[PDB]
C-alpha cells in the first residue's frame, strides 16, 4: 500500500502491488510437471500500467498410470497465449479499485483454469505478482471515494 | 492541415466587402480633411477669456476633475493645423465588417513649439487638447452648417477607448449624400508630436504633480497621444517585409473580439484592455525578436496560420505580467528580462511606452489563459474545430463565458456620500494614481475579492455594467443619477471562473502561528476581523482561519463575496444572485439528517448506499453457490453517481431506489443452449442466492421482480434484496452463452425480423454488456468533474418535467450532459451548477444532428480517441446518414470509445419526442439571449408543457409519495409481507409504457416518472399527453395493416375512437386519472 | 351517423357502449368483424376481429356469449381466444429461434366455431345485432366491466410467488434436461443413410440442428516455373518489356 493523502493523523493508501511469499512457491514447485508462467504489460481503465504475471503448474490426472506429465510445449505456448489473453482481457475492464476486488477472491485464477482445461488439466494457477510501473496523476477526490 | 486553409479562404471571402462600401466613406473623409484644411485658425488668448467664448455658443469644451481654474491655470492655446492621414486598422487595410460599427482613425498631429516641453504636470496637457478639440468641434459644426449636412450626420462627444482624459468626436450617421448602410461611427482624435519630452521621466514609476506617488495611466496616455505615427511607420516597414501580417491582423483579431478583447478597456471595470493594434505590435515584436541569445521565432516569410500559431504559443506560455516581459527597439531586436511589472507589460525604447497598460491584470491572466487553451486546441490532429476557433461567439452571452456573476448593487449616492459610503481610501494620493471613481473602484473590489477568495477562484472578472462611452453635446462629461450614484455605472457585476475544488471547502486558511505575528497574518485579521481566529486542526496545525457554513442553495463563495464586499467595499451595499438559488433549489432536497447545511458536491448518500452494496457484496461472497461467482458489479445510476434524489433509506416509490447489479459465475460449459431454459438457469441460481440469503443473513429481505425491458424474453426474473440499511438492489446474471445466444437469433432470424432482432440485440448490449464500461467511466470521471452529478440531476429533471425522459434514456442523457467538460470548446471547464446547465443548454441548441455526430471522449484533462478510431467513428456516422440521411429512426448519433456504434443509446425514440427536444433547446436558448437571467426566466425554463402537445391527462394518487420518496418537504421500516411496495409505489409510467407499446403505431404517449419532482408540493400530479402521427391525419379506409381504434362513419372511411381510447385510458387507470384535456 | 353497420368487402361493426368515468361528462367502442373459413387445424371456421379492445381475456368474451344465449338463445362452443397479442410480445418465438427443442392479422383475434349451424346462428344473429343497433342504439345487450385487469394484470409490483416459480422452474428443466439428453443421444448413435452412408459427427456436438446450421453458414499451391512454356514464356515477357 502507498500512502499518498494524509490528513487527521491518518494515511490514506492505495493498491501498489501484490506479491507472493517466497516459500509459497517454492511449496509449489515439484519436479516432474512443468511451469508455464506468463506476464503482460497491460493499462487498466485508469493511466494505471501493471505488469501482471502467472505461475500455472502442469497436472496429472487420475487414472494416469505413467509419472510424469509434462506439457508438449506447444501446449506451453497456446496455454501462455490463452492465459495473456484472459488477463489482459481481466484488465482493461477493472480500475484497481475493481481489479483489486478482483485479486481478492481469486477469481480470475478460476477464469484461467476453465479457460485451459481443454488443453492441459493445470493444478493451482495463481497470479503471484501484480506490479505498478506507471501511475496517472494524483485525483484526491478519487482517492477519497475509494476510502469513503 | 488540408481544411484549415480553406476555412482561412472561407473566412476572407465572408469578411471581404472591400470594394463597394470603401470608395463612398473614403470620398466622404476626402470632403472632411478638404473641411478641415479651410478651417481657419485661432489666434493666441487664455482661459478667462475661453470659458466666456464657449459660455453661450453651442458646444461645451470637455476636462477632467476638476474643472481648471483661473489660479493654476495661467494658460494659452495655439491654433496650429496639421496633416491628415489614415492610421491604424485603416492604414493596415484590415477592417472588418461588422455590423455594429467599426472606426477609423483621424490624424490631428501637433507642431513641436505651441505646446511647449513641459508636459509634466497636472493635465494641462490634455486640457489643451479639450480646449484643441472643442474650438475645432465648434468651428466643425459652423462648416455643417454652411455646407448643408445637418440631417443625416450627428458630431457627438464620445470616449476613446472608454479613457475617462481622452475624450473625442465621433460622427453618427443617423436617419447621392447619404449613409446608413455600412458602419457608423467615425472616429476624431488628436494627436502629438514624436518629441515633446526629456527620457529619464516616460517611464511609468515617475512623479513631478501634486501631492511620490507614481500615475501609470498618465505617463501612458501622454505617450500614447505621443505615438500615433512612429508606430504605423515601423508596422508599414514589417508589412513590406512579410507578405502574411494583413492575413495575420485579421485572424487575430476575429479571435480577440469572439473571445471579447476588444479594444475597449480594462482600467474602468471592463472586459477588455487589448485588441487588434496591440496584438498586431506584439506581433512585430516577435517578428524582430524574442530570444535571451537574439533568438528570432517569428520568420517574416511564412503563412497566417503558423503566425497565428507561434504568436499563440508564445504569449500564451511566456508570463508578461507577474514575473519578467520582453521589449524591443523599433528604430532591432527584442529581449526578455525577468523583471515583472506587476502590470501586463511590454517596452520599447523608440516610443518608450509600456502598450499593455490598458490591459489590467486580471484580464492579462485570463488572457494567457484564453491563448492557452486556442493553442491547445490546435495542437490536436484528431478532430477539426475551427468553429470552436473562430466561428463560435462566447462574449455575446454573459453567463456562459463565467460560471458565477453577482450584482453589486452600490447605492452609494454622491460624492459627499462618498466617505460615509465607502469604507475604502480617497484622497490626493490615489486620485494621482488612478484617475476616477470607477478606475480605482475597479481595482479595489478586485483586489478585495482575490484576496478574500484566492485559491477558490481561478480567474476574476469585473464589469462596472451600463457604462456610457458617449454622452451628448449639451454636457462637459457624463451626468449620470443611475441608481443610487452619479457615476459611470448602475451596478457592478463581479464574474467569476473558479476551481470547483475549492468551492465548497469550508476554512481559507491563512499563514501559520507564531510568536510575533507576521504581515501576512496581520494583514489577514484586518482583512477578517471578527471571521478571523485561530484554530488548532486534527493534525496538529495552530493556523489562523476563518471557518464558514456550507449550505446547499448558497454556495459559501457567495457568503465570502457578500462578507468581503459588506465590510471592506461598502456598509449599505448589496449583492445579487437569485438565479444560483432558484437552479440549486430545483435541485431535490433529500430527506438526509441535516441536508440542508449539506452542499451540492457532497455525494454522501451515494456514498453510504455503496457502503451498503459493499455489505451485500461481501455476504454473496462469502456464501457458496453451485459456481463460484466470477463477480458482482453494480450498474446503477447511483453507483455512477446520476441518481435524482440521493438515495435516502427506506424510498418505496423512487424509481431508482431498486439499483441494478450485474453478477455473472464462472465460465461454466454446462448452460443450456436454448434461451428460456437458459433464462429459468439463470433464475435458479438466483433462487438459490435467496434461499442461502434468507437462511443465514436474516435481516435481509428479498423477493423476485419480473423484467421485461429486454423483449422476447418475459421471465429474466432478478431478484430485489431489500437490505436492513434501507436500499434495494436489482440482481442480474451475466453468462457467456448470452450474447452468442442473441447473435444467433440474428443468424438464424427470418429475412422481415432483422432489424426487429438487431434491436432487441441493442437494448441487450446497451443494459448489459456495454452499461458497465459506462458506469465505471462516469464513474471515474464525476471525480474529475465536479459539477457534473449535479448539473445531470438538473439535466433530468428538466427532461421529466417536460415529460421527455419517459422515452429519453438516462444513458444518452448523461453523455449529452458530459460534452461541455470533456470537450468544452472554446469555453473553460465548468464551474457552476448554472454555468454547466445552461451549457449543456447551448450546446444541444448549436449543435445540428444530419451532418455533425456527439463523437467525444469520456477521459480526465492534461486513452483517448486516437486518428484511427475518430476517422472510424466518422466513417460509421456517414454510413448511417447514407442509408438514412435525414434521421427517421436514428436522430442522434452520440458515441464515444466505450460505444463506437452511436446507435445504442440513442436508438428507439420517435422524431416528435427528438423534434421537441431540439426545439426546446433552440427555445431556451433564445429566450435567453433575449430576456437575461431572472426568477421569471428559470420558473418558465422549468414550467411544463402548455404548448402543441395534444392530450393533458391529470392524475393523482390516494396518498402523497415524498415521505415515501425522500424529497423532504418518515419512513424507517419495511412492511411485514412485500407486497406493500404494490400500493406504495407509483404506476404511471410502465402503465404509459405498456399503452405505448399496445398503441405504437397511432399515437406516441408522453408522462412524467419521477412523479412528485415535477407534480407539486405534494406530490401527486402526473400527466399524460398524447401526439397522433402524421399518418393519421385524416380519414383513410380499413386495411390489413391500420393498427388503430376504428370508427368508419359510411363504408369507405374510417376514423379514429379517440373517445374510446381515452375511455378505456381511464378504466386502466381509474384509481389514478381524474381529468382530461384536449389542448 | 349511425344507420351504417356493414363495410365493403366482408366487414361488420360492433358498437357497445363504454362505462362512466368521472372526467368524461356517447363513449363507444367498435369491433370489425369478417369469418374466415381454412383448411387447417385451428385457422378453419374463425372470426377476425379488428380493434378487439385493451386486455381481452376470456372471462368477459365468455360472459359476452353467455348473455347471447341469455338472450336470443344462441348456441356457441367458444372457450377459447388465439392470436392474442394485445401489447406486440410475441410477434416472434426466440425460443425456437435460438434452439431446436422446447419446439417444433396485426391487431386482429380468432374467434373460432365448430359448427356450420354454430356460426351461421351467431353470424346472422351478429349481423341482426348490428342493424338493429343501426335502428335503436339504446337497448342492446350491454357490457359489464366485472375488471378483469384489476386482477389479471396488476402484477407489475407483485412479488412473484416463490413455490410457484419454485415448481415451474424445476418441471422445465426437468422435461429440458430430459430431451436435452435425448437430442445428444439420437446423434451419438449411429446414423447411416439407407444408401450406405454413415453420417461424420463431432466427439461432444449433442444435436444434428447444429450440424445443419454449421453446413448452411459454412455454404492452388504454385507454379510460376519449372515447366518448358513456363521458362520459355518467361524469356518471351524479358525479351518483350
Known amino acids: 500500500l502507498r500512502v499518498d493523502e494524509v490528513q487527521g493523523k491518518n494515511l490514506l493508501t492505495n493498491f501498489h502491488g501484490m506479491d507472493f511469499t517466497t516459500d509459497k512457491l517454492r511449496s509449489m514447485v515439484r519436479k516432474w510437471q512443468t511451469l508455464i508462467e506468463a506476464n503482460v504489460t497491460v493499462k487498466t481503465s485508469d493511466d494505471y500500467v501493471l505488469r501482471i504475471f502467472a505461475i500455472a503448474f502442469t497436472r496429472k490426472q487420475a487414472n494416469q498410470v505413467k509419472r510424469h506429465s509434462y506439457a508438449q510445449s506447444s501446449h506451453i505456448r497456446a496455454i501462455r497465449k490463452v492465459i495473456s489473453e484472459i488477463l489482459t482481457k481481466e484488465v482493461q475492464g477493472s480500475t484497481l479499485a475493481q481489479l483489486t476486488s478482483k485479486l481478492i477472491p481469486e477469481v480470475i485464477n478460476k477464469e484461467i483454469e476453465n479457460a485451459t482445461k481443454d488443453i492441459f488439466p493445470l493444478q493451482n494457477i495463481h497470479v503471484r505478482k501484480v506490479k505498478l510501473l506507471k501511475q496517472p496523476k494524483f485525483d484526491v477526490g478519487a482517492l477519497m471515494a475509494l476510502h469513503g | 492541415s488540408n481544411i484549415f486553409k480553406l476555412q482561412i479562404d472561407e473566412l476572407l471571402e465572408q469578411v471581404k466587402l472591400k470594394q463597394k462600401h470603401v470608395l463612398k466613406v473614403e470620398k466622404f473623409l476626402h470632403k472632411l480633411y478638404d473641411i478641415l484644411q479651410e478651417i481657419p485658425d485661432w489666434e493666441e488668448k487664455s482661459l478667462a477669456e475661453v470659458d466666456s467664448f464657449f459660455k453661450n455658443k453651442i458646444v461645451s469644451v470637455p476636462f477632467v476633475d476638476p474643472k481648471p481654474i483661473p489660479q493654476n491655470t495661467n494658460y494659452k492655446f495655439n491654433y496650429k493645423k496639421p496633416d491628415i492621414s489614415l492610421i491604424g486598422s485603416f492604414a493596415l487595410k484590415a477592417g472588418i465588417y461588422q455590423p455594429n460599427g467599426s472606426s477609423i482613425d483621424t490624424l490631428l498631429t501637433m507642431p513641436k513649439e505651441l505646446f511647449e516641453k513641459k508636459d509634466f504636470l497636472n493635465f494641462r496637457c490634455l486640457h489643451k487638447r479639450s480646449v484643441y478639440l472643442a474650438y475645432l468641434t465648434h468651428h466643425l459644426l459652423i462648416l455643417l452648417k454652411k455646407d448643408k449636412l445637418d440631417s443625416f450626420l450627428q458630431l457627438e462627444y464620445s470616449y476613446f477607448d472608454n479613457d475617462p482624459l481622452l475624450p473625442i468626436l465621433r460622427i453618427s450617421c443617423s436617419k447621392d449624400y447619404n449613409f446608413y448602410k455600412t458602419r457608423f461611427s467615425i472616429n476624431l482624435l488628436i494627436g502629438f508630436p514624436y518629441k515633446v519630452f526629456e527620457p529619464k521621466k516616460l517611464l511609468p514609476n515617475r512623479n513631478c504633480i501634486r501631492i511620490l506617488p507614481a500615475t501609470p495611466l498618465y505617463n501612458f496616455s501622454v505617450l500614447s497621444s505621443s505615438t500615433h505615427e512612429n508606430y504605423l511607420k515601423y508596422l508599414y516597414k514589417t508589412k513590406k517585409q512579410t507578405e502574411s501580417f494583413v492575413e495575420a491582423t485579421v485572424l487575430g483579431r476575429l479571435w480577440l473580439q469572439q473571445r471579447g478583447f476588444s479594444s475597449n478597456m480594462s482600467h474602468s471595470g471592463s472586459l477588455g484592455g487589448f485588441g487588434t493594434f496591440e496584438f498586431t505590435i506584439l506581433m512585430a515584436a516577435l517578428l524582430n525578436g524574442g530570444g535571451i541569445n537574439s533568438n528570432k521565432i517569428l520568420l517574416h516569410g511564412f503563412s497566417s496560420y503558423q503566425l497565428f500559431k507561434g504568436v499563440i504559443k508564445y504569449l500564451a506560455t511566456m508570463d508578461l505580467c507577474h514575473d519578467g516581459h520582453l521589449q524591443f527597439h523599433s528604430n532591432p531586436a527584442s529581449k526578455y528580462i525577468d523583471e515583472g511589472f506587476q502590470t501586463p507589460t511590454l517596452f520599447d525604447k523608440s516610443t518608450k511606452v509600456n502598450i499593455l497598460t490598458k490591459m489590467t491584470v486580471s484580464s492579462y491572466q485570463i488572457l494567457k489563459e484564453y491563448a492557452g487553451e486556442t493553442l491547445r486546441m490546435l495542437n490536436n490532429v484528431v478532430q477539426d474545430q475551427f468553429s470552436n476557433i473562430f466561428l463560435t461567439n462566447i462574449s455575446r452571452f454573459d453567463n456562459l463565458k463565467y460560471d458565477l456573476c453577482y450584482d453589486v448593487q452600490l447605492p452609494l449616492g454622491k460624492y459627499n456620500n462618498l466617505e460615509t459610503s465607502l469604507a475604502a481610501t480617497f484622497g490626493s494620493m490615489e486620485r494621482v494614481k488612478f484617475i476616477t471613481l470607477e478606475n480605482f473602484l475597479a481595482h479595489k473590489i478586485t483586489n478585495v475579492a482575490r484576496y478574500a477568495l484566492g485559491d477558490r477562484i481561478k480567474y476574476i472578472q469585473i464589469e462596472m455594467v451600463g457604462q456610457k462611452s458617449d454622452f451628448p453635446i449639451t454636457k462637459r462629461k457624463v451626468y449620470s443619477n443611475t441608481g443610487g450614484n452619479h457615476f459611470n455605472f448602475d451596478f457592478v457585476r463581479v464574474k467569476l471562473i473558479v476551481n470547483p475544488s475549492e468551492c465548497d471547502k469550508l476554512v481559507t486558511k491563512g499563514p501559520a502561528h507564531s510568536e510575533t505575528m507576521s504581515t501576512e497574518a496581520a494583514v489577514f485579521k484586518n482583512f477578517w476581523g471578527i471571521k478571523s481566529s485561530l484554530r488548532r486542526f486534527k493534525d496538529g496545525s495552530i493556523t489562523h482561519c476563518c471557518v464558514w457554513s456550507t449550505s446547499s442553495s448558497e454556495p459559501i463563495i457567495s457568503s465570502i463575496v457578500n462578507f468581503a464586499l459588506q465590510k471592506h467595499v461598502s456598509k449599505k451595499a448589496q449583492i445579487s444572485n437569485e438565479t444560483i438559488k432558484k437552479f440549486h433549489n430545483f435541485l431535490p432536497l433529500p430527506n438526509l439528517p441535516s441536508s440542508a447545511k449539506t452542499s451540492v458536491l457532497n455525494l454522501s448518500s451515494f456514498f453510504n448506499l455503496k457502503k451498503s452494496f459493499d455489505d451485500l457484496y461481501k455476504i454473496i461472497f462469502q456464501m457458496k453457490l453451485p459456481l463460484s461467482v466470477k463477480s458482482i458489479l453494480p450498474v446503477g445510476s447511483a453507483f455512477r453517481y446520476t441518481s435524482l434524489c440521493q438515495p435516502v433509506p427506506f424510498a418505496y416509490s423512487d424509481p431508482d431506489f431498486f439499483q441494478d447489479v450485474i453478477l455473472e459465475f464462472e465460465t461454466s460449459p454446462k448452460w443450456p443452449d436454448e434461451i428460456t431454459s437458459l433464462e429459468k438457469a439463470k433464475t435458479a441460481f438466483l433462487l438459490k442466492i435467496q434461499e442461502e440469503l434468507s437462511a443465514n443473513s436474516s435481516t435481509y429481505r428479498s423477493f423476485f421482480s419480473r423484467d421485461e425491458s429486454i423483449p422476447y424474453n418475459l421471465e429474466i426474473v432478478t431478484l430485489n434484496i431489500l437490505t436492513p440499511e434501507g436500499y434495494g438492489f436489482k440482481f442480474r446474471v451475466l453468462t457467456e452463452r448470452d450474447e452468442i445466444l442473441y447473435l444467433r437469433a440474428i443468424a438464424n432470424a427470418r429475412n422481415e425480423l432483422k432489424p426487429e432482432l438487431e434491436a432487441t440485440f441493442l437494448k441487450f448490449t446497451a443494459k448489459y454488456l456495454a452499461s458497465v464500461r459506462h458506469t465505471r467511466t462516469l464513474e471515474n470521471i464525476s471525480h474529475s468533474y465536479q459539477f457534473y452529478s449535479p448539473v445531470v440531476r438538473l439535466f433530468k429533471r428538466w427532461l421529466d418535467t417536460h415529460l421527455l425522459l419517459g422515452h429519453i434514456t438516462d444513458e444518452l442523457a448523461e453523455l449529452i450532459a458530459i460534452k461541455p467538460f470533456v470537450d468544452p470548446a472554446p469555453y473553460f471547464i465548468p464551474g457552476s451548477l448554472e454555468n454547466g446547465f445552461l451549457k449543456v443548454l447551448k450546446f444541444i441548441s448549436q449543435w445540428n444532428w444530419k451532418d455533425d455526430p456527439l463523437i467525444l471522449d469520456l477521459v480526465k484533462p492534461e486513452e483517448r480517441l486516437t486518428l484511427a478510431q475518430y476517422k472510424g467513428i466518422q466513417m460509421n456516422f456517414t454510413n448511417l446518414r447514407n442509408s438514412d440521411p435525414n434521421g427517421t429512426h436514428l436522430q442522434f448519433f452520440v458515441a464515444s470509445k466505450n460505444d463506437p456504434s452511436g446507435i445504442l443509446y440513442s436508438s428507439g425514440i420517435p422524431l416528435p419526442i427528438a423534434t421537441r427536444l431540439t426545439a426546446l433547446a433552440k427555445v431556451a436558448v433564445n429566450l435567453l439571449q433575449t430576456h437575461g437571467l431572472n426568477q421569471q426566466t428559470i420558473n418558465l425554463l422549468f414550467t411544463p408543457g402548455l404548448k402543441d402537445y395534444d392530450f393533458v391527462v391529470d392524475l393523482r394518487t390516494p396518498i402523497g409519495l415524498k415521505s415515501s420518496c425522500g424529497i423532504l418537504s418518515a419512513p424507517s421500516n419495511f412492511p411485514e409481507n412485500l407486497n406493500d411496495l404494490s400500493e406504495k409505489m407509483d404506476p404511471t409510467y410502465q402503465l404509459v409504457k405498456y399503452l405505448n407499446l399496445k398503441y405504437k403505431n397511432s399515437l406516441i404517449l408522453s408522462s412524467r416518472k419521477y412523479i412528485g419532482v415535477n407534480g407539486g408540493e405534494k406530490g401527486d400530479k402526473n400527466v399524460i399527453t398524447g401526439l397522433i402521427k402524421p399518418l393519421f391525419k385524416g380519414a383513410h379506409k380499413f386495411r390489413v395493416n391500420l393498427d388503430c381504434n376504428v370508427k368508419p362513419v359510411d363504408d369507405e372511411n374510417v376514423i379514429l375512437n379517440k373517445e374510446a381510447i381515452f375511455h378505456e385510458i381511464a378504466a386502466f387507470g381509474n384509481d389514478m386519472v381524474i381529468n382530461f384535456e384536449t389542448d | ?241
Not at chain 3, 167 to 181: P, Y
Not at chain 3, 212 to 234: C, G, P, S
Request: with cysteine.
Open chain 3, 1 to 241: 351517423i349511425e344507420d351504417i353497420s356493414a363495410m365493403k368487402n366482408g366487414f361488420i361493426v360492433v358498437p357497445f357502449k363504454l362505462p362512466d368515468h368521472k372526467a368524461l361528462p356517447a363513449s363507444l367502442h367498435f369491433m370489425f368483424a369478417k369469418r374466415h373459413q381454412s383448411s387447417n387445424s385451428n385457422e378453419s371456421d374463425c372470426l377476425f376481429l379488428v380493434n378487439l379492445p385493451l386486455l381481452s381475456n376470456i372471462e368477459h368474451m365468455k360472459k359476452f356469449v353467455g348473455q347471447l344465449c341469455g338472450k336470443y338463445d344462441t348456441v356457441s362452443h367458444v372457450e377459447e381466444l388465439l392470436y392474442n397479442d394485445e401489447f406486440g410480445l410475441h410477434e416472434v418465438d426466440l425460443s425456437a429461434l435460438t434452439s431446436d427443442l422446447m419446439s417444433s392479422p396485426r391487431n386482429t383475434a380468432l374467434l373460432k366455431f365448430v359448427d356450420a349451424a354454430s356460426i351461421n346462428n351467431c353470424w346472422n344473429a351478429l349481423k341482426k345485432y348490428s342493424n338493429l343497433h343501426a335502428k335503436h342504439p339504446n337497448e342492446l345487450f350491454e357490457w359489464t366491466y366485472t375488471t378483469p385487469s384489476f386482477t389479471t394484470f396488476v402484477n407489475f409490483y407483485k412479488p412473484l410467488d416463490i413455490d410457484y416459480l419454485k415448481e415451474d422452474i424445476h418441471t422445465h428443466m426437468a422435461i429440458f434436461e430430459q430431451r436435452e439428453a435425448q437430442a445428444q443421444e439420437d446423434v451419438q448413435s449411429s446414423i447411416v443413410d439407407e444408401d450406405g452412408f454413415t453420417l461424420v459427427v463431432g466427439k461432444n456436438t449433442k444435436s444434428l440442428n447444429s450440424i445443419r446450421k454449421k453446413i448452411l453458414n459454412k455454404n492452388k499451391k504454385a507454379k510460376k516455373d519449372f515447366y518448358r512454356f513456363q521458362v520459355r514464356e518467361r524469356k518471351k515477357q524479358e525479351i518483350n518489356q
